[PDB]
Design a protein around this ligand. Sequence first.
Ligand code: AKG
Ligand code: MG
Ligand code: MG
Lengths: 368, 375
Amino acid sequence: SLKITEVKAHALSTPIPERMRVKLNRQMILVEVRTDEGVTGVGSPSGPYDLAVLKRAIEDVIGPQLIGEDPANINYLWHKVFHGEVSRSVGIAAMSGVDIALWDLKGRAMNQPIYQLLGGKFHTRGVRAYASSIYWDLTPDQAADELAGWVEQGFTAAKLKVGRAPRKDAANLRAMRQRVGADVEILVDANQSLGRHDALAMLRILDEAGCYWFEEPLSIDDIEGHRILRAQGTPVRIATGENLYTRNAFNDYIRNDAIDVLQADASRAGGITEALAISASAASAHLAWNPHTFNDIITVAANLHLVAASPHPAMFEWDITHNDLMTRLASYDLKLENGLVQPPQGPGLGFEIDWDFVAAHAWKGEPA
Amino acid sequence: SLKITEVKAHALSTPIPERMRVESGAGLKLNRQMILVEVRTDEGVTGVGSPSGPYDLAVLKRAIEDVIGPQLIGEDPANINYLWHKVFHGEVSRSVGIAAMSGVDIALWDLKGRAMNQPIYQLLGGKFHTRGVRAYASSIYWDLTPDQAADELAGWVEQGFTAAKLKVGRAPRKDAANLRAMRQRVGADVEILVDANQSLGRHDALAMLRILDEAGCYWFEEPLSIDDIEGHRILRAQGTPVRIATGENLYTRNAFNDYIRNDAIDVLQADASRAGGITEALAISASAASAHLAWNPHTFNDIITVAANLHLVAASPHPAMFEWDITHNDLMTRLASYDLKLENGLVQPPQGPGLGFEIDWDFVAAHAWKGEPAI
Ligand SMILES: O=C(O)CCC(=O)C(=O)O
Ligand SMILES: [Mg+2]
Ligand SMILES: [Mg+2]
């Protein structure tokens, strides 16, 4: 029986090189939960959110509610904190990072990867990944080149940011499909930038180009607009969720027949604990859960252990942008085999932290 | 035009003299705490706000000064609508983020009213409730005995209150006994409100509702977890004369819309200092009115949160049921030159510019936070 002695939040911030910027810094909080017997777990509450707000929430609001507690009771602790002080968002985010750390700690205590605790792999072969993402302000040829580039590197799917210039978005999509043919999935992300009627015009283009999904087509507040898009009955999936923070917001999408793909992120929506609940509610409704994963290798890994164990058709976000928090933080890297990735096979999240890298990038006050 | 030069968040803390344990969780209530937001301009016109509480003072100070602040420095403060959306859609989007915005928005409205030398309610179309706003005493603690509960209610009625709120849900047999004794002591003219603080499941709430109906209670506040909209609809669907109320812990129009869409609410209790400022409270109030429901805000933290809500209530066409925190609280009585004037069971908003009173800045300087938790 362990006891928690420390809850630490390490603020990290690395500037993005000039020629890469589409974006000032890749930031994260590396949560570290320590115990009296020396078993340690780590986590990440995603981002970008203010690092000092997160650090303060984790060490000084959540932390004291955990000191002295048996880390094994993750279910109890999640509910202790939720009905502790945070309730009376960045708070759910803060909770998520701690929750992941607790799951990592649990896997490490048992010497098992997280996915083994969750019933083992569903996707034994691996998980279909997509390249995230091809960004704004490209010509048709550049968009198609970058896509062909990802395919050549082994991806069978990629995402395109759209919504700033819909006529150009359409030109891009047509060049892309033409370049790669029908066997590559092309995903689209509008980041809430469209109203209902522009989204409907866009959906007709997506349908013609055979797009896999239309992500955040509208403001997250407009559930009815999402219902309208879904109601058009195209084979293009309506997707949202990276900016939703509760089951009792995802349920409102479900109840209203408003969504095809839930994108709840374990590092944002209440941890592995709540992501398990959100994933199951999606399954119950015969809808997909394909999480947003974009921040660092910890948020990616946390989501990947759940994805690998879930029966959902996989469409797994893999950040391909220049990001030291993806490639340098830990011993686990991208490895594609026939378009598929496999979760780390070590204990807990399944890899080791490069603590030299950690200390080298402590936050000094940088924004993003 | 003016330009914003500074956005400050004064963290304030005052010691609680009485020894009071928290409702549950072996700990004492140590300090009353607040952020006093201060927005300054190049021509020296200042506005103040409060993002309510209890929230972590460091979290709020950082969010106000270092996340919102930079987005406002240099901006014209007169364009509150533009700024609200510059902030909301620019940054604090991707809560305590909405809480931080709320305090800032209130300070912008205070700044505006002061710039124009007018109280906020005048900007909002002037008074609807010209004679005053009906207040209730908040709140009678639950664990009391029937005669102790009835005595507190008698006591508030004697002070001139026409309505009071009782905490319930922790021991429904006691709750039931308290209400029978209360309704006995004062009769039928006094409104009895009830607050369960989300402590009930659906079925116990349904049992409770029957007793509230019997005692002719005005509303049933936070009968259930704020995440159980369907449960609230079920309670409302029983068709009793008891209003289903919630909202002090909801922070967006969207959450309130969800309740409305689902026939789940009678009284929205969005707090201007929590739910997105006077700006968003205006929108939430109008939505209540459009659906023929009431908006009676939660107001409980300090005189600024109270005054911000009261300016809006006074200009609004809802039947008034205005929360007056009756506990010992220096942030209610010593922060500013304005106080409770109950006359015929009614309050009036402050008559000065903006929020309508002056801050006691000596009090502020003397009560600077130094790291202590509220609990
Ligand atoms: O803190 C208290 O006792 C009152 C909180 C509450 O539920 C209210 O003011 O409505
Ligand atoms: Mg996205
Ligand atoms: Mg209440």
